[PDB]
Design a protein around this ligand. Structure first.
Ligand code: HEM
Ligand code: HEM
Ligand SMILES: [Cl-]
Length: 105
């Protein structure tokens, strides 16, 4: 429907992934970086919704996984330090979101 919106979503997704990976490599991240990631997360989520307004079952899966990853991140917003356990459970989920989005491409 709108390729411009799809590519905005993609580019935002890429940037979420980069600071995610960047943040993974540090025991403590500045609030600036943590906030960039999460503002970007908010905008990929928003652009994804905008597109719902491939197959329906694949979009459904991706959407459900997005919500789960976003809800997971919100819990991490309350923590000055997120542990390996938390950080890796979030990474695993986020990986499934990326995969399913790429499966639609
Ligand atoms: C929030 C985290 C999300 C991430 C990291 C994410 C990531 C991606 C990625 C990487 C793609 C493939 C883009 C490409 O390579 O061209 C994609 C496509 C897509 N995403 Fe998401 N997504 C997210 C959330 C959502 C949500 C919440 C929705 C819907 C409510 C959504 C709907 C879509 C749709 C419909 C496409 C395919 C668009 C098209 O084919 O024209 N996404 N997503
Ligand atoms: C794909 C969609 C993703 C969404 C919607 C998302 C969302 C969030 C949110 C809302 C937070 C809370 C921010 C904070 O604690 O300050 C967060 C934290 C985090 N995310 Fe993500 N994230 C995604 C992908 C990733 C990926 C792929 C990685 C790693 C490769 C990652 C690594 C992290 C890390 C390490 C934190 C914690 C930062 C810290 O404790 O200093 N995220 N994420
Ligand atoms: Cl804490």
């Amino acid at each position: 429907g709108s390729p411009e919106l799809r590519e905005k979503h993609r580019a935002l997704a890429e940037q979420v992934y980069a600071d995610g990976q960047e943040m993974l490599k540090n025991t403590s991240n500045s609030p600036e970086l943590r906030e960039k990631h999460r503002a970007l997360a908010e905008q990929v989520y928003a652009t994804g919704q905008e597109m719902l307004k491939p197959s329906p079952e694949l979009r459904e899966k991706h959407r459900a996984l997005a919500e789960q990853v976003y809800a997971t991140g919100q819990e991490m917003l309350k923590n000055t330090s997120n542990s390996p356990e938390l950080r890796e459970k979030h990474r695993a989920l986020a990986e499934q979101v990326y995969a399913t989005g790429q499966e639609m491409l």
